[PDB]
Amino acid sequence: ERMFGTYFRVGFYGTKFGDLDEQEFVYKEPAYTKLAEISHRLEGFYGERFGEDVVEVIKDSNPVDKCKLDPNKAYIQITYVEPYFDTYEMKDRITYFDKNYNLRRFMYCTPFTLDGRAHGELHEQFKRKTILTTSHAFPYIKTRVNVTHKEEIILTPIEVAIEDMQKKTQELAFATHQDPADPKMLQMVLQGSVGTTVNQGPLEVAQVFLSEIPSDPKLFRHHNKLRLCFKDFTKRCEDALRKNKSLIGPDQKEYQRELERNYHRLKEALQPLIN
Amino acid sequence: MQTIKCVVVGDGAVGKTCLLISYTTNKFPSEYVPTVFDNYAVTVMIGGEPYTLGLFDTAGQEDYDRLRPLSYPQTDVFLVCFSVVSPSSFENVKEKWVPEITHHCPKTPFLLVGTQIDLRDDPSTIEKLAKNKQKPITPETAEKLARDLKAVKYVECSALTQKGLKNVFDEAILAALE
């Protein structure tokens, strides 16, 4: 999705920035520009000018509260962002060939707990989807254009579980139905879905959320959706498993055997909570 | 061409995963949206051409000694990882990790990645480890370890100050193309 190019929010905090102080841009970089790159540059450029030791870089994304900030120092907050679309805006970016034409909304996610931590347990994890609206729109005459409005949305931890599941259900879905196939990308997605070794695995998600049928049916429209997303997930793992059996040679036969074994072990456990 | 299989091995709590998820998502280690699944994909540009790098994340526990080398076949390049302020983990590079990937994959290139290098030049951890008779790993004492071990080279980075982060992955791709 860098047919569109790479976009970061940039906030300028400090009197030493002259007219930039309390202004906030969305920068447009070339495609696949990495967070290291821009942050090297903006610190490098205000290093050369104010002195290396006053350029402090806000390695954050929570909105800047003006107080906590040493007023002597020059603070730059940098956050990667993605172009944000209507469901109507998006649909038309499917069917007509030119798609880079009204980029004025940009989205970032920042994770939290009520605790004031960034990350928590599966049931403690919150996410704030923020939508930035810029004054003018890309593509534009300048490469940065500043932010005029801002919208925050909050996802209850179960809504967060859903977005995690949906993205990886689709990551499988894509790595399966694609020509010519990519076996390494497919096994990479597949193993990290059914045969996880490091993170929490998808089972613990069903367990933490799908174990009790909630009363409050405003929360039921959540419980159900996660229940159905596991159904689509478990259908896309099969398909992917099947498809990897085609693509492998002899060396990866024990590999696939374990990936298979890992799956039925999981669908086993899943089935109580899904049905 | 196609995806590059890069398998990443090393002790848990060198923050091996912490940096995989943060480079690939363009996030600081404080703001990445955490997940439950494993492995991460990323497109790096290199000489104007864009290569995609499949990042295979592996538990550093003994408990997985039996299962882990199942990912090793068809690997293109290895990132062997240690934290420069965890000399337990830099010993497990000589005598666990590099032997393991070179036993199943003798012709496959690997890299030495030091990580968490911000805590090296950090006052509170230096004498914290010295207060059990240990100094962090200087790049000197790691650069030779990699020449000793016929690694492609040594690289070190910080997930947090992003320093040398891009270099780690540029070299991994490059090493896969030779």
Curated annotation (Swiss-Prot), chain A:
N6-acetyllysine: residues carrying this PTM: 127
Tissues in which the protein is found: Widely expressed.
Stretches of the chain forming a coiled coil according to its record: 251-275
Top-rank taxon, per record: Eukaryota
Subcellular localization: Cell projection, Axon
Domain DOCKER: 1-275
Family: Belongs to the DOCK family.
UniProt free text on domains: The DOCKER domain mediates GEF activity.
Description of how the protein assembles with itself and partners: Component of the DOCK7-induced septin displacement/DISP complex, at least composed of DOCK7, LRCH3 and MYO6. Interacts with TSC1. Interacts with nucleotide-free RAC1 and RAC3. Interacts with TACC3 and CRY1. Interacts with NOD2.
Recorded disease: Developmental and epileptic encephalopathy 23: A severe disease characterized by early-onset intractable epilepsy, dysmorphic features, intellectual disability, and cortical blindness. Brain imaging shows an abnormally marked pontobulbar sulcus with mild pontine hypoplasia, white matter abnormalities, and atrophy in the occipital lobe.
The protein's role, per its UniProt record: Functions as a guanine nucleotide exchange factor (GEF), which activates Rac1 and Rac3 Rho small GTPases by exchanging bound GDP for free GTP. Does not have a GEF activity for CDC42. Required for STMN1 'Ser-15' phosphorylation during axon formation and consequently for neuronal polarization. As part of the DISP complex, may regulate the association of septins with actin and thereby regulate the actin cytoskeleton. Has a role in pigmentation.
Protein name per Swiss-Prot or TrEMBL: Dedicator of cytokinesis protein 7
Origin organism lineage: Eukaryota, Metazoa, Chordata, Craniata, Vertebrata
Gene of this entry: DOCK7
Residue window of the full protein shown: 1836 to 2110 of 2140
From Swiss-Prot, chain B:
Top-level taxon: Eukaryota
Keyword Membrane: yes
Assigned EC number: 3.6.5.2
Broad class of where this protein is predominantly found: membrane
A Pfam family that the UniProt record links to this protein: Ras
Keyword Membrane on entry: yes
GO biological process: actin cytoskeleton organization; actin filament organization; adherens junction organization; cardiac conduction system development; cardiac neural crest cell migration involved in outflow tract morphogenesis; cell junction assembly; cellular response to type II interferon; dendritic cell migration
Modification after translation: (Microbial infection) AMPylation at Tyr-32 and Thr-35 are mediated by bacterial enzymes in case of infection by H.somnus and V.parahaemolyticus, respectively. AMPylation occurs in the effector region and leads to inactivation of the GTPase activity by preventing the interaction with downstream effectors, thereby inhibiting actin assembly in infected cells. It is unclear whether some human enzyme mediates AMPylation; FICD has such ability in vitro but additional experiments remain to be done to confirm results in vivo. Phosphorylated by SRC in an EGF-dependent manner, this stimulates the binding of the Rho-GDP dissociation inhibitor RhoGDI.
Modification Phosphotyrosine, positions: 64
Reaction(s) the record says it catalyses: GTP + H2O = GDP + phosphate + H(+)
Glycosylation sites: 32, 35
Activity control note: Regulated by guanine nucleotide exchange factors (GEFs) which promote the exchange of bound GDP for free GTP, GTPase activating proteins (GAPs) which increase the GTP hydrolysis activity, and GDP dissociation inhibitors which inhibit the dissociation of the nucleotide from the GTPase.
Assigned GO CC terms: apical part of cell; cell-cell junction; centrosome; cytoplasm; cytoplasmic ribonucleoprotein granule; cytosol; dendrite; endoplasmic reticulum membrane
CDD domains: Cdc42
PROSITE patterns associated with the record: RHO (PS51420)
Record keywords, A-Z: Cell membrane, Cell projection, Cytoplasm, Cytoskeleton, Differentiation, Disease variant, Glycoprotein, GTP-binding, Hydrolase, Intellectual disability, Lipoprotein, Membrane, Methylation, Neurogenesis, Nucleotide-binding, Phosphoprotein, Prenylation
Subunit annotation: Interacts with CDC42EP1, CDC42EP2, CDC42EP3, CDC42EP4, CDC42EP5, CDC42SE1, CDC42SE2, PARD6A, PARD6B and PARD6G (in a GTP-dependent manner). Interacts with activated CSPG4 and with BAIAP2. Interacts with activated CSPG4 and with BAIAP2. Interacts with DOCK11/Zizimin2; the interaction activates CDC42 by exchanging GDP for GTP. Interacts with DOCK9; the interaction activates CDC42 by exchanging GDP for GTP. Interacts with DOCK8 (via DHR-2 domain); the interaction activates CDC42 by exchanging GDP for GTP. Interacts with IQGAP1. Interacts with NET1 and ARHGAP33/TCGAP.
Alphabetical list of PANTHER family matching this protein: RHO FAMILY GTPASE
Name of the protein in its database record: Cell division control protein 42 homolog
Gene expressing this chain: CDC42
